[PDB]
Amino acid sequence: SMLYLLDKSDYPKVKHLVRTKEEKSDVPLNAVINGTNVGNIYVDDPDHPKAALVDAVGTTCFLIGDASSPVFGEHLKDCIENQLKDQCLESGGSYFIATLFDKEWEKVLENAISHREYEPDYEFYHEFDKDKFNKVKSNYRSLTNEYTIKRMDKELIQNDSDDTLRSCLSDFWDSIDDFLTKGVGFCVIKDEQVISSCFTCYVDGNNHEISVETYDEEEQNKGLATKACEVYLEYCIENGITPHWSTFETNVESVNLASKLGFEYRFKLKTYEFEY
Ligand SMILES: CC(=O)SCCNC(=O)CCNC(=O)[C@H](O)C(C)(C)COP(=O)(O)OP(=O)(O)OC[C@H]1O[C@@H](n2cnc3c(N)ncnc32)[C@H](O)[C@@H]1OP(=O)(O)O
Ligand SMILES: [Cl-]
16 A cells, blocks of 8 residues: 555665665665665665665665566655655755666556656766776876865764755765764865865675765866875775775766776766756
């Protein structure tokens, strides 16, 4: 009769739905299932899930498991338009995003979101090539004197005159302490303000998903995100972390930056997005 919100203590019951290589390598999906990062899980049957909506609220939901699930066919719309919607909007969000592994889920999701003026896209997935990065980074533009690099610590996050960073981190991490213990991040600073950041938004074991941004529109295209990422990726290499970059096909600034940093294209997944 409805999709059921799953308690975190039962998340292990959906692990068996993570089966293909693309599913297994998807850091946000696994980070939410592991309980490590912020998200919600909805299932057909809380005792023995056969299909799940895994909402990595900072980035996308995923539909996994059996696309023929009758309850998903009749009540996926109800879950989107009330339970997902209300928690998104109350938390300052505006959008629904879904990412699919399996063509069979497309018609199921399309019937559920049909009246929405949704935008189809694809999410690009990569593999980081450390040797390429180490070769090509010598060509990156050096920072001029007004710009410096700082590792994200509690002082930086709590004293950003804009709560920009704190707000972004809250999409992914239940606390700043959890981010600082389990993740890492670096910023470009100018006039004592955070201009760019590169940080871990999800963790699955030694796999870290990247979030990058240059917040000051007028400072883009100067090499700032590149340098925040370069320091981040060096940290990852030094500490045995595999970084992951996934981005919408239409976000060509991000697609091109990923290629510049030594991320190599591997596969793409269909996405759907609308504004509530
Ligand atoms: C993995 C993820 O985080 S996915 C989400 C990515 N982040 C966002 O979408 C947030 C909004 N966008 C941004 O903040 C910025 O556009 C960013 C972070 C993608 C890039 O920040 P910038 O500070 O402008 O990047 P930076 O100047 O260091 O690098 C430019 C590189 O990025 C790509 N790029 C940047 N702008 C463009 C553009 N108009 N067109 C094409 N490629 C571009 C190019 O590879 C360019 O290479 P170059 O240095 O050889 O010219
Ligand atoms: Cl597979």
